[model samples]
Target: ASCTFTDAASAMASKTACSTITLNNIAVPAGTTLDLTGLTSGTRVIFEGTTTFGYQEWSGPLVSISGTDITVQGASGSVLDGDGARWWDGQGSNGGKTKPKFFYAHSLDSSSITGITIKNSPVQVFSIQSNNLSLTDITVDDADGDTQGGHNTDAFDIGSSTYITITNANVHNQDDCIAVNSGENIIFTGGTCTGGHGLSIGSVGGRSDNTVKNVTIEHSTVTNSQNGVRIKTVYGATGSVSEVTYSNIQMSGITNYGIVIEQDYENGSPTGTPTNGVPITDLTLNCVTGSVSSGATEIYILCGSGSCSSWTWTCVSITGGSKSTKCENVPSGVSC
Candidate 1:
């Protein structure tokens, strides 16, 4: 059967159908969630026109989707507006009126999602967990959050899944463009990020059995951000981040550390004392070209004693930034 939904009521009512579903100009009600979990196998969902959510100070992902072999596409010019401006007070998700989040694609397998424009997310945009998932051509425009007190509006946050690919994204936010909390066999490429923290591997090492490996980030641009490319493991935690490769990356106008790898990350600042609990191994930065703004640190590596090895930094080049190097316990044969 085919389902057409024009509001949250109809959408939720028809969500369990075993066929195609189309959402046309749906206005989700306040404090309500449109849960599309457990969709029928091979379900095809499309969004026509626009969807916007009502304002509320609550924990939310106004929309969510979960299942296998599902495909979600937005028609050209279609948008999912989170109405984040109503909740922006410069303290996002940290301390404020509890604002709702945007999208969650959880427990999905063998699926493809693309062609959606998300604007003004109140907080982090996409929280994803998918096996063999592909996401492309997704646009996140939170530039208004910059002027209207937006904070921590990360573009993509990926954790605990594998064989995923994300490409062709354009993001502007206040935090990491793509923050990979923990995962393997992941690839991120062909993206543009601005007004945020650059790509990251982890603020990892808080949980047991935590690991992020075999990740590649290439052919991307990060401009006017805080850190260009970073890998941060929290002090006094146990886990590992290994076999990460970054190549063909372009960065400029970075205000802080251009490229940072630290084992002393703590609440947006490093404690300056590296810890050995969580080790970083087999990291490579090849063919990365970037320049930080004047007075910014060119490269900073703060590793725990005997906690890092097999790092290759040849062919990584940065110019036009201060010649400042803060190194503590970096591995042998790896120079910054």
Candidate 2:
């Protein structure tokens, strides 16, 4: 069946029976999910007109999707608005109202999401947990949160999946543009990150699956953010981050370190010491040229003794930040 729905109840009640579902100008109520899970193979879901969610303080993914061999796309000029302004208090997920994440692309396989524009997530935006997924030409516009206290508004939080590719994403958020927590065979390319924490990997330990390998991020630009290209392992957890590569990336106006690789990360708490529980090995950075603010650091590496190895770095031209004097175990080709 091919159907177009404008109400949430009818869509949920009849989704399985429809091979092609179009959500048009949907105004979802508070404390509800436009759940589109357990779909049949080869299903196509389209978002038309504007999709807005009501104000709520619950842990919500206003929209969720999951299916094998599925295609999810947005019609021209469609908007998925989260209306995060009602919940933003500068504390994000920590102190103020419990803001719901925007979208959950969980348990998907061989799926694709293309040409979608999401605006104003309450907190974090997309939580991805899927295999063989491709997200292309997507835009995440959370710049409003930039002024109205948008904390921890990560654009993409990928975990526990493989063969996931996100390309040409134009994002403006407050936190990590893309955070690969634990995944393999992941690729992010041709992306622009503005007013966010740059492309990150890990904060690796302290999760159910804490291993990141065989990932490549290339041809990206990060502007006016805190950190650019960060790889942070948890302070005292056991994990492994290996075989990760970043190529042809550029950054400017970075407030923090332009390139930071550390093994001493704990949210709201930094031990200022590296541990060997997580070994960072076989990393490569090619043609990563950028500049950070004068007050920021150029590069900072805080690896545990003998835990980081086999790094190939070339053509790194990061200027306008002082080098760190407290760097430890920086690989041979790069400087701190």
Candidate 3:
């Protein structure tokens, strides 16, 4: 079935077994989830006009979609706006009144999402769980959240998925531009990330069977952020993140560590003691050029002995910051 809707009720009613769904300038009511979970295989969703979600104070993914070979696209000037200002109180998902999040894509295999603008997410923006997915030409503009007490408005949070590629994204947020929680064979390239924490992999650990490997971030620019390219593991984590590569990354105005590879990471700061429980190995940074502000550190590494190895950093230049090195158990073939 193919359907078109301008309201939530009709959209949900027509969603069952839908093959082509089109949304035209709908205002989703509060406490409502615009669920597209029962669509037919290879469904294509197109959006026109601003799809705005009403304000709510509950943990929410305001919109959700599930299926295989799915595709979501938007017309020029189309927007998915979450009215987050009402929920902004300086605390995001950590505390606060549980602001509803924006989008969640589940079980979507071989999917592609493009040409959409997601704005003012109440908490973290997109929680993606899919395989063989490609996302390009997307904009996550939470720059307003920077001044409105947006705490942890992470742009893309990926986990438990594989073989994904994200390119040509413009993410302006208060938290990580893209947080690779747990995945394999993921690639992020050619993005502009500003006013947020830079690209990251893990804060891994705290669970069994946790693994993040074979990830690459290339040709991206991180400006006016906290950390540039970071790999952090909990102080007592138990998993491993290996086989990661970064190339042609440019960063400036970094407020904190430009390249932070540490195993002593807690929520707020490092515990100053590296542990060997969650090993990080086989990492490389090539042709990474960046600078940081005064009093900031260019690179800071704290790894457990016998846990980090075969790491290489080549053609890396970071200047304009007070040089700081707290390297422990320095991996062979790499220098910081």
Candidate 4:
């Protein structure tokens, strides 16, 4: 217990010797995961100071944690650098270029990842699948992606997981700050998202595919991003996303659209035509106040025929962006 690790390259290879590990000023090898496999039931890990990684473009769960009730805390101003510039190709999570995602925590029960500064993740960062977990005070500082080719560096992709609460996280990416896919009882509150595609739900929906439902994004800030809030479904998706809510968000400097709901997602391959199969219901934007620049479109819906149903909004305000496109195929009472 209470072991000090200075190299992520050699640490955790024999994790049995590591009942409790504290990583300090470590440098991780390129593309290799600091895998915490076979960890005991109740492990406690901590990281202090800057832990940087070399360049590698690969599908990665670069840092993983698994246990019954784990706690991972970073010291004040601890940095977990992903060195993404060596990977960004202006096309993130798509093709043309490969970017290493930053952190992935999986299969841990009642866990927490807090107070870590993550930077320069090539594609996506923080893909989490944990039960009964809380992620707070994590900062994603991707402001470097702006002048560079920071293509699709998204923050916090929660997929196929449940019973999680994420709050007080600051995100600076090029895509949806948080995307909840196929999860239940998920809450995201008190966060800041900038220079990204705002909060999103279900970008990878399909026929007979699982969907994200029962989520809340509240008391957040979105600025200098593409969209303030959005929910996207793959065309011809046969599933459903329901009972999602957003409240009390401050936003500005959005482009293309402030808020969007599109059913024609083509996985970075847009064909322009949408298919209608997924049924969306019980979506609400309540007590949300935000202003957008006039150059931005306020809202846009590309739901195909016979798709999208049952949505309500109350006290949702927008100041400068132009009015939205159309209802397309969604039911009535759901308007821009």
Candidate 5:
């Protein structure tokens, strides 16, 4: 039953008797793990042509997939080139050259990764965990890690997932093209984030599966990024960001804060103080239209007293920056 598997020790010694595992042109080595996990259930992993990796220093994810109705694909003009400039020394995992973290869709049930084509990752590409997943038409280009030092290359980093769905992605990374730190019924649609760091939902309360529920982001677009939208929480951890929704998002040249929500994440920088243990509830911003970068800051909220409640702003217009006097407890008449 060797239906095409080219190397990685014969696809990790015949990955649980393949049903369809064609990783052609693979060259993964040095501190290895192209390990398509203990599959044997609904298998079908295919990535052809150039799939490479070699340099090492640990903390890699190189590539590690799991099974349960699995199906990972990429065949035409395929690539998984994590040659990330052989570990860009931009202090990625914070502190110089010791990177390696590409993919680990640590999934288990109802999987589907489609149209994958990635490049230059050496730090955070995809570290998703799931119960029911569906990622479609992905295309992550590291943009040469900005200036080659490439720090925290995050593309998709959902955690403790459940019914996750990512569609039509086209990301150029630096960080958080999509980072739903904790999940529950999450869905990101027609995404298009460039130069990254927007479209997030947590610095979320120190992780251990914080708790982000019922999320939905629609028809997205964020360009030249550094915050087209964000939700952070940490400083004095506890958790719960509920029923979130952002629709019809569109942004341009956003240099910083087209929209930002904070609860003071610490150790990833932020802590100007604003904490109520992560309680941002029933949020929704519809038809979000944006434009920023004249010193950036279209909207910024730092919650605490009353801890942000029941929001539903419509036709949000994020224009030119600068309009936040360190907002606090925002949730009533929208746009910080």
Candidate 6:
């Protein structure tokens, strides 16, 4: 069954089951979730209009979808504007103001987000926690908050998720383009990141005992950012991020370091010398060639003793900075 609506907030919730709902140009009122809690399996939902939020200071998912075997499609001109410029004060998610993530998807069998423009997120734009999720052709634009006042505005923040694949997406933000905490069988391929920290995994691996394994980041581009293709684990942490690989990456206009894998990040900054408690083994970089701007190093690594093992690097070129590669007890056959 297929259902179409113009005013979704007024529609009865009982009819949501066993239907393909097409919502057209609906304005979701503030402080109320446009909930699609119960839908039939293999159902489809298409948003035809920009879902704008009403003015209110509240914790919002604002938009949410929950079902099994569902797909959400947005037409080319569609927008889910977060109006974050009104809420940004350089403290996002870490709390200067109380703002929720822009879009949240949780507990689905399989889902995909396609052809959408999510702009000016007040915090992390996309918070996904599905088991089998595949996202493509989605854009998260927080480029306006880069220099002004936006902090911790990561593009995609994933935690405790597995069997997810994200590819062919574009993100412009102020923080990590994609932040992965603990996951396995994750593939991030053919993506473009600009004006933010490059692709990241495990910014919180030091706090939790969960390890991110079987991950691959291939065929991505980063530009005008702080670092590129980074994995930052907290010091004094115990866990492992194994079987991570990067291949065929292009970078330009980088600031700090081209490729960084550190385990000393504290409060978004590296504190003391990294402790060798976490195990970061099985990292392979092959055919990864890119150029960085004239103020950043080619690579910077800070690993603990007996931590970085079974790593190999081949055919990497960095064209600027000071040509400093810090390898702290990372073994032979791997030089950054």
Best candidate, TM-score-wise?
2
Candidate lDDT (C-alpha), each:
0.87, 0.92, 0.86, 0.79, 0.87, 0.78
- Write down the TM-score of every candidate: 0.97, 0.99, 0.97, 0.94, 0.37, 0.93
How much does candidate 2 score in TM-score?
0.99
**Candidate 1 segments whose C-alpha is farther than 4 A from its true place:** none
Name model 6 segments beyond 4 Å from true.
11-15, 206-209
lDDT of 2 by residue, 193-278 (tens): 99999999978999899999999999999999999889999998999999999999999999988999999998886689999899
Scanning candidate 3 in windows of ten residues, the lowest lDDT window is 202-211
Q: Listing every candidate in turn, what is its Cα RMSD in Å to the true structure after a full C-alpha superposition?
A: 1.3, 0.8, 1.3, 1.9, 15.5, 1.9
Q: Write the per-residue lDDT of candidate 5 for residues 149-252, one digit (tens) a residue.
A: 88888898888889989998999988889888788998999999999888988778776889999989899899998899888878788989899998999998
- lDDT (tens digit, per residue) of candidate 1 on 1-336: 888888778777777774888999988888877777788879888988889898878989888988999998988999998879899999898888798878888877898889988989989898887788888999999999889999989888888879889999999999999988888999999999999999998888785436899999999999999988999899888888999999889999999878889998876567889899878899989888789998788888899988888898767788877765568776766666
Rate residue 226 of model 2 by lDDT: 92
lDDT score of model 4?
0.79
* Model 2 whole-model lDDT (C-alpha atoms): 0.92
* Number of the top lDDT candidate: 2
Candidate 5 residue-wise lDDT at 42:
86
Model 5 TM-score, all chains together = 0.37
What clash pairs does model 4 have? none
- Candidate 3 vs candidate 6: the TM-score winner is 3
